[PDB]
């Protein structure tokens, strides 16, 4: 089992969601970036695993779940089995990562991608170990009701560029954004 990563798009006032949808209008190429980063496996014979909370799962249009070409794991303590379409269910992030070293998943999974929401990000970000954050900065303020936790730059180093990630400013629907990669190892 390979690297641990969080991926998120965030507005200037730290928002990541409003009523289970994105705060901004759909950015087609940003969704393509999310799909490409989470799906592309460095190791053949394996898929990457995407981990998400319950509200993030249900925020993906039914036609699109599970996220294709990735193993989909949902976090919940209320649910008693994976939702329709999902592959795995765990009670907690630490349980999910533990499942990842069990018989079944250990030889199937390449990279692990935490794709939201807010409490899952917070926990990952504050847990010791090697972790990267792939952060799309949407360069405007958008009304939101769920936010991405503070990035502690004492621990998370912004990388000066990363392979496969454009470094320059992007714009779609009149909204400028840029892609960043942060790395901690503690
Ligand atoms: N990158 C972006 O811009 C992203 C945006 N989104 C958006 O953000 C918002 C949805 O997210 P948010 O409100 O943060 O909630 P999250 O998806 O975490 O979902 C929370 C639910 O999942 C369960 N859960 C979360 N963490 C854990 C854990 N460690 N263990 C077990 N269960 C857990 C809880 O279910 P239970 O109560 O059953 O225990 C909780 O009700 C939406 O608006 C969506 O559009 C989501 C991801 C990324
Ligand atoms: C239809 C699929 C591709 C879809 C629909 C909604 C969402 N969400 C909540 C979402 C949407 N865009 C996102 N972009 C980045 N950079 N990171 C994320 N974690 C991210 C998450 C994700 C995928």
UniProtKB/Swiss-Prot annotation:
Q: What is its EC number?
A: 1.5.1.3
Localization, per the record, is: Mitochondrion; Cytoplasm
Q: In which tissues is it expressed?
A: Widely expressed in fetal and adult tissues, including throughout the fetal and adult brains and whole blood. Expression is higher in the adult brain than in the fetal brain.
A molecular function (GO) held by this record is: NADP binding
Residues binding substrate, per UniProt: 30-35, 64, 70
The Gene Ontology CC terms held by the record are:
cytosol; mitochondrion
Which one GO biological process term can you cite for this protein?
Answer: tetrahydrofolate metabolic process
Q: Please give the name of this protein.
A: Dihydrofolate reductase
Which CDD domains has this protein been placed in? DHFR
As annotated, the protein's associated disorder is:
Megaloblastic anemia due to dihydrofolate reductase deficiency: An inborn error of metabolism, characterized by megaloblastic anemia and/or pancytopenia, severe cerebral folate deficiency, and cerebral tetrahydrobiopterin deficiency. Clinical features include variable neurologic symptoms, ranging from severe developmental delay and generalized seizures in infancy, to childhood absence epilepsy with learning difficulties, to lack of symptoms.
Summarizing the function annotation, the protein's role is:
Key enzyme in folate metabolism. Contributes to the de novo mitochondrial thymidylate biosynthesis pathway. Catalyzes an essential reaction for de novo glycine and purine synthesis, and for DNA precursor synthesis. Binds its own mRNA and that of DHFR2.
* Species this chain originates from: Homo sapiens
Return the Gene3D superfamilies for the record: Dihydrofolate Reductase, subunit A (3.40.430.10)
User: Do you know which Pfam families this protein is assigned to?
Assistant: DHFR_1
**Binding residues annotated for NADP(+), in chain numbering:** 9, 15-21, 54-56, 76-78, 116-123
Q: Its principal location?
A: mitochondrion
Q: Which residues form the DHFR domain?
A: 3-184
**SUPFAM superfamilies documented for this protein:** Dihydrofolate reductase-like
Family of the protein in this entry: Belongs to the dihydrofolate reductase family.
Q: In which pathway does it act?
A: Cofactor biosynthesis; tetrahydrofolate biosynthesis; 5,6,7,8-tetrahydrofolate from 7,8-dihydrofolate: step 1/1
Cross-referenced InterPro entries, in alphabetical order? DHFR, DHFR-like_dom_sf, DHFR_CS, DHFR_dom
Residues folding into a coiled coil are none
Q: What's the subunit arrangement here? A: Homodimer.
């Amino acid at each position: 089992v390979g690297s641990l990563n969080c991926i998120v798009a965030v507005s200037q006032n730290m928002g990541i969601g409003k009523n289970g949808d994105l705060p901004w209008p759909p950015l087609r190429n940003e969704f393509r970036y999310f799909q490409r980063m989470t799906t592309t496996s460095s190791v053949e014979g394996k898929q990457n695993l995407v981990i998400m909370g319950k509200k993030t799962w249900f925020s993906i249009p039914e036609k699109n779940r599970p996220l294709k070409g990735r193993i989909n794991l949902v976090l919940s303590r209320e649910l008693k089995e994976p939702p329709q379409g999902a592959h795995f269910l765990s009670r907690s992030l630490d349980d999910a990562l533990k499942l990842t070293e069990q018989p079944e998943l250990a030889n199937k999974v390449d990279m692990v991608w935490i794709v939201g929401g807010s409490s899952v990000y917070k926990e990952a970000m504050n847990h010791p170990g090697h972790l990267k954050l792939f952060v799309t900065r949407i360069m405007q303020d958008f009304e939101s009701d769920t936010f991405f936790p503070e990035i502690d730059l004492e621990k998370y180093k912004l990388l000066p560029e990363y392979p496969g990630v454009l470094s320059d400013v992007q714009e779609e629907k009149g909204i400028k954004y840029k892609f960043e990669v942060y790395e901690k190892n503690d």
